[PDB]
Amino acid sequence: IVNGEEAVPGSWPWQVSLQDKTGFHFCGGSLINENWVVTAAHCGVTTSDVVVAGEFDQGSSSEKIQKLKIAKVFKNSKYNSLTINNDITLLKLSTAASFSQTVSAVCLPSASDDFAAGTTCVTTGWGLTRY
Amino acid sequence: NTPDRLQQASLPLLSNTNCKKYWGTKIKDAMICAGASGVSSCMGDSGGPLVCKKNGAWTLVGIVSWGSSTCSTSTPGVYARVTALVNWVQQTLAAN
């Protein structure tokens, strides 16, 4: 995020980091329950990648994080790689997350819920802060 | 290098019709745009949440997807529109 600010630690408890086997953060995701993470299909997650829950500072070794293995990747069958449309994947965890003060789920909308243009929302992540 | 500490930003939703002024026919019905407000999602944010408060609870409205290649803060970012996708989520959870 360019021109954002640091979050309060633990205040976005559904936010996960997707890391490869070398420990490199490559995408975010969100917990929707103890067993499932939603992310973008174009992130290209495989069962060799790791879900890191409960993280705040990726440079600190002191945080009580959960490193969760991925059992199966469910890429939406309507995902179109050419247009990047329907850009959603579900990850079924091998190891359930343990919910706590710093690890818990985001709500899903109903299919008929409305979010109007001009509404102020929030986004979070460990993406670049400058290009 | 990605930052060590988790970042946040508040930003407005746009309509797809207005987002098309920036991105033309690249905007599909399963996309929602947000930003162009002095902040931007950027590389490494992909897959993470765009949440809006609804009846007191944070609700997943978008999944960070794509946008400007330089993360321009005057151009809207594009997110997967979760309301268009939530049937599939529910069906997948129920079957697995």
Binding site: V8, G10, S11, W12, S100, Q101, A105, V106 | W58
Partner: peptide, 10 residues
């Protein structure tokens, strides 16, 4: 869902 134990500050 959706209600953090540690409230965000925006």
């Amino acid at each position: 869902c959706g209600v953090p134990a540690i409230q965000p500050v925006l």
